[PDB]
Ligand binder design. Structure first.
Ligand SMILES: [Mg+2]
Ligand SMILES: [Mg+2]
Ligand SMILES: [Mg+2]
Ligand SMILES: [Mg+2]
Ligand SMILES: [Mg+2]
Ligand SMILES: [Mg+2]
Ligand SMILES: [Mg+2]
Ligand SMILES: [Mg+2]
Ligand SMILES: [Mg+2]
Ligand SMILES: [Mg+2]
Ligand SMILES: [Mg+2]
Ligand SMILES: [Mg+2]
Ligand SMILES: [Mg+2]
Ligand SMILES: [Mg+2]
Ligand SMILES: [Mg+2]
Ligand SMILES: [Mg+2]
Lengths: 151, 123, 252
RNA sequence: UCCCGGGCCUUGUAACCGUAGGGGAACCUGCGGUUGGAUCACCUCCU
RNA sequence: CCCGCAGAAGAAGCACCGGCUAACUCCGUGCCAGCAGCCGCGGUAAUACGGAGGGUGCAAGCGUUAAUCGGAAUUACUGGGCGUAAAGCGCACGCAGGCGGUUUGUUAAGUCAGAUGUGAAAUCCCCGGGCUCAACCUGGGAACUGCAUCUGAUACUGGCAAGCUUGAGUCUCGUAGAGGGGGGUAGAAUUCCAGGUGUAGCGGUGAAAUGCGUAGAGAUCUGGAGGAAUACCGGUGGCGAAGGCGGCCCCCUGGACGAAGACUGACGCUCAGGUGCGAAAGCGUGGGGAGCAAACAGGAUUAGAUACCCUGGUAGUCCACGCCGUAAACGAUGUCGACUUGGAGGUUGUGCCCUUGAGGCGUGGCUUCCGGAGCUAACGCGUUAAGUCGACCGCCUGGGGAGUACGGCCGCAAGGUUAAAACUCAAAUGAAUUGACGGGGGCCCGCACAAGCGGUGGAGCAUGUGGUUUAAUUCGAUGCAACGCGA
RNA sequence: UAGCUAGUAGGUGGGGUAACGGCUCACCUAGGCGACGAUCCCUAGCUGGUCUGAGAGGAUGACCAGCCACACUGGAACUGA
C-alpha cells in the first residue's frame, strides 16, 4: 500500500541519495493513524541517528509538496533482524534462506507461507514452501519477510 | 448490602496487572534491537521520536523509547530497558537506559548527567 | 452518493484489478478523475460507460482520458455487453464504482451476460458484500447471495474505511471480484425456478422448510431428495437448492 | 399591512425498547411497548 | 584502647528550581526539536527546551527503575452505593437459609465475670543495663487480642416448658369492580356473493400512473355470506402479581374492602437454589382468513430513493393445542413491618346526626395532585418518601472491547441464559448554569413604509471614480459607512 | 470444576505394627462423602514473624528460631534405638 509509489520513491530517493543511503522498502498503513514506513539500509550501517537524519529531511521535503496528508505521520527504519523484502534482486541475495510470504492470490495450498528461497525467476520467487517447493509471482505476492528464524 | 450476603460471599477486592509486564518485576531487563526507526508523531508535529523493537532475554519483544541524542544503536546491538511511559505515544512503557552495556552517555550534556549515562567532565 | 478520495486505497484497488491489454476491459461509473485515470493509464486503451452525460463530457474532454478511452453515455442496464464482448474480441472485465441503488440491477444485468463477462470487479457496502459471500448456515445468507453464488464464484478483494470517500459515508465498504463459472458447478434446468424457490423460502425463513418449500413439494419428495423438511431456509446450501430447482422443472 | 435597519420580550423552531423481515447508506419496512421527544461552546490572573 | 609526631593539611557529591513542590534570571534556541510523574512546556525571552549565573533540597552519597502497603472509604468489618451517574431479578409463589411480637417458669448453649493451665524463644512495646554515642547487645517487665478447662452470673439472645392476644389467620353479613376460565347472543361496520334499478365513469395523488368498468363498474336498493372488532358510557375511573383486562347475557371461578361481633392462639416476614405466570414479535401442529399488512410485486417520486406516495399482496394478524421466555416487561424506584407537618381532589364501603330529600358530623379502603420537615449531586422525593428505621433478598464497582468470546445449560429454530479476557482510553458519566440557539416568535420603533412635494436616472456641460492610454498620466480612499473624497 | 467413592463406608474373623486403625485379607453389610462446596483443576512448603497501615485491614514468610519435605531421576529394601 502506497500513494504514487514511484513518485514517492523518487521524492524520498533525493534525500536518501543526498545522504548516500539506500532505499529498501516503502509501505503505508491505514487505520487509527494513517502512516508511512520507509525501510532504508546502508551496508556500512544505519544507526538510529541515520534514521533521524533522513526522517527530518523527508518530514520537510515530502510535506511541502505532499500529494496527500490524511491522518499523516511517518517513520524511517532499518529493515529488521527478520527483514521485509520486495524485489527479485532481494530474494536473489538470499537464495537458500528461510522466509515468510503473504499474497494477492488468496487460495488453498495456502497463499500464506513459510519457505526457504529455492531460486529467483525474473517474474517469480521459487521457494521451498512447507519443505515442498513451489513458485509465486512478484505480482501475485504482496508482502514478504526473511530469516523469520530470528524471533 | 446485608452482612448475611457478605458472609455468603465476601468482598471481592480487584486485582491489577503490572502495566509494564515484560519486566516480570525485574528492575531492568536486557535485549537486542530487532529493528530501529524514527517517527514524526503527526502531520504538523516536528518532534521526531526515536524508537526500537527489542527482544528481551525472556523472549518477549517490545517497543522501547530512545531518549536524548543519537548513538551507534543499530539492529545487532544490545540494550538495557527500564520502566517509563512516553505519555504522548501509544503504549510506549519502556525506556532504554543511557550509558547501558552498548549505549553511549550524552557526551555534550552538563546537566542532570546521571540520568544521561555520562561522567563528570574531566576538569 | 460517493466516490473515493485517498491515493493509497485508489492505488490498491486499481493495482489489485491488474488492468492490462490482453483483457477486454470496460469501466462503469468513472466518476472522479483520480480513480479512472490509473486504469485508463495502465490499459493502453480502455472502454467506459458513464451514466451521466455531463461527467462523460468532463472526462471525454480530458486529454489524459478522451484520447485513451472509448466512452459511452447511458444507463448501463440498457447496455448490450454481449455485443461489446464481441467488439472487445473476448468476454469482458467489467469494473468500477457507482451510487449503487442500481447495484441490485447491476448484478442481474451482469448475470444476463455470464457468457459475455469474464469477471466483475466492484466496490460495495459492507453488509451486502458480507451477505453476497455468506456461507449457507448464517443469518447473513439469503436469496440474493444464493443467486450470486449460483452464477459466479465470489471473492472479497479488500475493505475500505469510511473517511476514504470524497463525501465520507458512515458505512465501511469493500471491493469484491467475481467469476462466472467456466462450467456451472451447479447445472440447472432453469434459473426462474431457483429464483422463485429461493424467494418463497426466504419470504418464510423463520419456519421449517416443510412450512416453506413443503408448501409446494411433499415431505416425501424432500426426504426423497435427501433433504430433512424440518430444517429452516437458512440451513440450505445452493447445491440442494439447485437440486430442488431441477426437481421442480423436471417433474412439472 | 408591507419595505429598511435597529432597540427590545423571546423557541412556526422525534428518539428509542423488544422482536421479525428488507436490505446503496447512517439505513427501509411490520408488530406492539417506552418518553429518557436537541442543540453546541476559547483567549489570563493576585493576594 | 591509650600515647607521641607533623600539617589544613588527606577527604563532596547528586538531584531539582512553571504548578503540585522548597528553590529564577540572563543567555541562546525555534516547535530545532528537545522536555516529561501529571497538568502540560515552545518559535522569537522558554522561570518548563539547551547553555550560564543564581537558587533549593539531600549528602558519602544522590538520583532512576521494579515491587508491596499507603493515599484508596477506590470492595467501604470498622467504612460505600443501586429514580436519572454502574447497579432493584418482567412478575409471583415457595423449599433450604436468615430473621422474628408478648408473659411466666426453667435451662445455661451464646453472652458476661472470675480462676487455672496454656499461648517457645527471639521479634514487638515498656523500664533498665552495657558498648565513648549510636546502630548494636542485653537484664526485667509488659505483651502474646487466642485455645482449653473449671468456677460462678442470668439482663439479653438461644434451648425447654407453660401460657397471651396486639401480629398472623378462620367465621358470619354486606359492597365495588374491563380479575380469570367456559358457553351463548346483539347492533353498528368492512369485504364478498346474488339479484334489482341504473350508465360512463370510477379509483387514486401534489399531480400522476398502475388499478376497476360497457361482460353494466362506480352508485343505490334488496337478499345472503364470512371473518374480525366492540363506536358512545369511558373518567386525572375500576379490577389484576406483573404481563394485562372494555358490546350483552349465562355458566364456572380468583382476589379485595367495609360492617359488626365470634374464633384460633405467634400459626409470622423474607427467600439462594427451586417452581410457575409472564407484552409484542417468531416458532411448533391442525383449523380460519373479514379487515389490516413485514416480505414480495407493480406503478410513481427523487440527482439517486433502496425511502417518503399509490395500486396490489404473502407470511402474519384470528382459533385450539404445544414452544419461545424477551420488551424503555420502567414508578427506570426489590419484598415486609413501624414511625413522621399539612392541603385540594377523585373513587368505594361504613357510622352517626340527618327536619326529609339535599345537608352535616364522623369513619375505613383505594387513588390523584400540591407541598412542610427531612432528604437529595442536583433534578427532585415528600405519610402511597427518594424522610426516620428494623429483617431478608437481588444488584454495581472507570470508559470502550462486550452482555461480545469461550464453556455449560436451555430452546424445534430463532435465539435465550450464565459469561470472560487480551486489548485500548484518560476519561466515560449524571444534574444543573450561561451564551450560541435562531430556524425564530411576538413587542415594536425612525421621512423605514405609507401620504405628498421636489428631484436623480434621457440632453449638454462641471466634477469625482473606474477603464484605457502614456515617458509620466504621482499617491491614498474603492457597498452602506470610497467616488465635487485627502485637495 | 457437581456430584463423589468399592478397601469405597461400616461389621465380623484371620493376618499385621512399638502402638490404635481396611493397616491388610477373607467373608458380610451398603454404606460413606458433598452445594456448611465434596469431586476436579490451578497455584503454594508451613509458622513465630516481617512490611505497610491510625486502626481494622492489606501484602508477605528473605535473614534468624520452630515445624515440614526433598538429596542425579524413578523404584524398593538392609541395618539400627
Ligand atoms: Mg407494558
Ligand atoms: Mg514555589
Ligand atoms: Mg461510590
Ligand atoms: Mg444507570
Ligand atoms: Mg423490579
Ligand atoms: Mg426472642
Ligand atoms: Mg428465654
Ligand atoms: Mg401459527
Ligand atoms: Mg402473535
Ligand atoms: Mg450470550
Ligand atoms: Mg444624467
Ligand atoms: Mg502607500
Ligand atoms: Mg490602504
Ligand atoms: Mg459631498
Ligand atoms: Mg481386628
Ligand atoms: Mg485507611
Amino acid at each position: 500500500m502506497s500513494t504514487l509509489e514511484q513518485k514517492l520513491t523518487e521524492m524520498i530517493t533525493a534525500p536518501v541519495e543526498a545522504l548516500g543511503f539506500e532505499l529498501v522498502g516503502i509501505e503505508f498503513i491505514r487505520g487509527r493513524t494513517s502512516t508511512l514506513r520507509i525501510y532504508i539500509d546502508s551496508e556500512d550501517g544505519i544507526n538510529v541517528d541515520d534514521c533521524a537524519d533522513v526522517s527530518h529531511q523527508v518530514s520537510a521535503v515530502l510535506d511541502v509538496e505532499d500529494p496527500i496528508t490524511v491522518a499523516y505521520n511517518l517513520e524511517v527504519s532499518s529493515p529488521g533482524l527478520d527483514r521485509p523484502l520486495f524485489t527479485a534482486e532481494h530474494y536473489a541475495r538470499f537464495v537458500g534462506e528461510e522466509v515468510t510470504l503473504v499474497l494477492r492470490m488468496a487460495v488453498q495450498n495456502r497463499r500464506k507461507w513459510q519457505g526457504v528461497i529455492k531460486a529467483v525467476d525474473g517474474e517469480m520467487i521459487t521457494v521451498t514452501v512447507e519443505g515442498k517447493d513451489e513458485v509465486f509471482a512478484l505480482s501475485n505476492i504482496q508482502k514478504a519477510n526473511l530469516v523469520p528464524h530470528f524471533a | 448490602a446485608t452482612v448475611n450476603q457478605l458472609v455468603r460471599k465476601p468482598r471481592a477486592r480487584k486485582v491489577a496487572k503490572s502495566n509494564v509486564p515484560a519486566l516480570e518485576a525485574c528492575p531492568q531487563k536486557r535485549g537486542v534491537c530487532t529493528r530501529v526507526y524514527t517517527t514524526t508523531p503527526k502531520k504538523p508535529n516536528s518532534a521526531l521520536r526515536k524508537v526500537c523493537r527489542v527482544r528481551l532475554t525472556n523472549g518477549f519483544e517490545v517497543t522501547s523509547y530512545i531518549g536524548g541524542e543519537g548513538h551507534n544503536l543499530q539492529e545487532h546491538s544490545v540494550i538495557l530497558i527500564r520502566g517509563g511511559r512516553v505519555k504522548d505515544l501509544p503504549g510506549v512503557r519502556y525506556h532504554t537506559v543511557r550509558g547501558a552495556l552498548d549505549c553511549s552517555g550524552v557526551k555534550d550534556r552538563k546537566q542532570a548527567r546521571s540520568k544521561y549515562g555520562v561522567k563528570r567532565p574531566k576538569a | 452518493q460517493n466516490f473515493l478520495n485517498d491515493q493509497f486505497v485508489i492505488d490498491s484497488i486499481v493495482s489489485a484489478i491488474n488492468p492490462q491489454k490482453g483483457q477486454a476491459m470496460v469501466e462503469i461509473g468513472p466518476g472522479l478523475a483520480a480513480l479512472t485515470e490509473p486504469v485508463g493509464e495502465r490499459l493502453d486503451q480502455l472502454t467506459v460507460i458513464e451514466l451521466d452525460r455531463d461527467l462523460a463530457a468532463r472526462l471525454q474532454t480530458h486529454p489524459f482520458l478522451g484520447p485513451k478511452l472509448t466512452i459511452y453515455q447511458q444507463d448501463a442496464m440498457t447496455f448490450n455487453f454481449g455485443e461489446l464482448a464481441e467488439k472487445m474480441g473476448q468476454p469482458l472485465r467489467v469494473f468500477g464504482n457507482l451510487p449503487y441503488n442500481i447495484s441490485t440491477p447491476l448484478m442481474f444485468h451482469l448475470f444476463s451476460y455470464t457468457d459475455a463477462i469474464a469477471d466483475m470487479h466492484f466496490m460495495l457496502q459492507k453488509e451486502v458484500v458480507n451477505r453476497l459471500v455468506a456461507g449457507p448456515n448464517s443469518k447473513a445468507y439469503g436469496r440474493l447471495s444464493v443467486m450470486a453464488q449460483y452464477y459466479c464464484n465470489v471473492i472479497p478483494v479488500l475493505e475500505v474505511p469510511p473517511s476514504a470517500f470524497t463525501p465520507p459515508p458512515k458505512v465501511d465498504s469493500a471491493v469484491v471480484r467475481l467469476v462466472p463459472h467456466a462450467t456451472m458447478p451447479h447445472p440447472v434446468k432453469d434459473v426462474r425456478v431457483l429464483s422463485r424457490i429461493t424467494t418463497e423460502a426466504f419470504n418464510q425463513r423463520r419456519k421449517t422448510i416443510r412450512n416453506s418449500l413443503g408448501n409446494l413439494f411433499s415431505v416425501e419428495v424432500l426426504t426423497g431428495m435427501g433433504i430433512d423438511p424440518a430444517m429452516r431456509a437458512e440451513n440450505i446450501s445452493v447445491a440442494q437448492y439447485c437440486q430442488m430447482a431441477n426437481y421442480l422443472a423436471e417433474n412439472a
